[PDB]
Design a protein around this ligand. Structure first.
Ligand SMILES: [Zn+2]
Ligand SMILES: [Zn+2]
Ligand SMILES: [Zn+2]
Ligand SMILES: [Zn+2]
Ligand SMILES: [Zn+2]
Ligand SMILES: [Zn+2]
Ligand SMILES: [Zn+2]
Lengths: 182, 185
């Protein structure tokens, strides 16, 4: 099955580190933004998404707190890691079992897996994960209902679980802290 | 598969007499960041026929009917004419129109899965390496032009129609008011 193929491929490694490039395309197909950064991901639930361009910022979850640090505005915002998917979709790359995909219909074409929300009332868009038969994640795409798509491609993949330390974010000096856990 | 790279690459290209598709381009610097994007559409009929219509970065048209290669630029409103048998001199895209082993005579070819890497056997070539990604069913997914210093111009195909375009698609007619730069020599 497609869900089982996706999950078994994600399960081949407990984590990875990589650089990424990003391209955002309008519904018309026009490039709106290009960006880049780095990622560390350990399964389940742990992700450290570091954006270099165009908006330098850090998003990091230890499975309990989701932190958002933006250096330009000297701000740290706190969220429940329970509500990660509401805030960011990158947490999908940290899944590793078929029951994690209950909200979606899954389809496979080669290494490309498309996850479509089951309900039709959805405002959420579809997702795509490109992952090799050896379990190497090649890309991730977020497609809005109106056709706008943000595309992430991974390179320089280190197919090893990052240390737990990488996700234990400490609030730094010189920032305001906005608690959004309640 | 990988023990006969040119035969496999040839057999896969021969699976369809042509295709049409949209394409998107990314150029990556030697340090791996995106420095340029583009898009357009392509029609290919095998052998030798191609129509590569670019929208970005520069809007322009390249089309060969096997005899004449036309390059039309709408900003300068000029079309240059070339001999089609020298198409490779002007564009690497003609490589997607091949379908037999003797067409890869100038290259060492490596197959790793669906990715075929074409390397000029001698280092002198101003051109660097080429990469064609094509399924076992013959569907071209992408094409890369790689420079020696690491820069890569990467093309990805989408909305593919695995069907031969009509021969009429490649019978370019020079539009009224366009200047003609004849290089057929
Ligand atoms: Zn994170
Ligand atoms: Zn709240
Ligand atoms: Zn053969
Ligand atoms: Zn055009
Ligand atoms: Zn132009
Ligand atoms: Zn060899
Ligand atoms: Zn005109």
């Amino acid at each position: 099955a497609p869900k089982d193929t996706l999950s078994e491929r994600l399960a081949m490694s407990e984590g990875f580190s990589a650089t990424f490039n990003q391209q955002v395309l309008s519904p018309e197909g026009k490039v709106i933004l290009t960006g880049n950064g780095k990622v560390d991901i350990a399964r389940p639930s742990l992700f450290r998404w570091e954006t270099e361009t165009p908006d330098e910022n850090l998003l990091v979850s230890d499975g309990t707190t989701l932190w958002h640090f933006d250096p330009f505005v000297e701000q740290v915002t706190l969220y429940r890691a329970e509500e990660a998917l509401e805030q960011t979709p990158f947490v999908l790359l940290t899944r590793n079992k078929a029951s994690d995909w209950d909200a979606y219909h899954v389809e496979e074409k080669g290494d490309v897996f498309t996850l479509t929300p089951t309900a039709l009332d959805s405002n959420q868009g579809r997702f795509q994960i490109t992952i090799s038969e050896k379990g190497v994640v090649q890309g991730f795409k977020v497609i809005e209902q109106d056709g706008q798509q943000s595309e992430f491609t991974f390179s320089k993949v280190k197919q090893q679980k990052p240390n737990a330390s990488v996700f234990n974010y400490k609030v730094p000096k010189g920032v305001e802290v906005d608690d959004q856990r309640n």
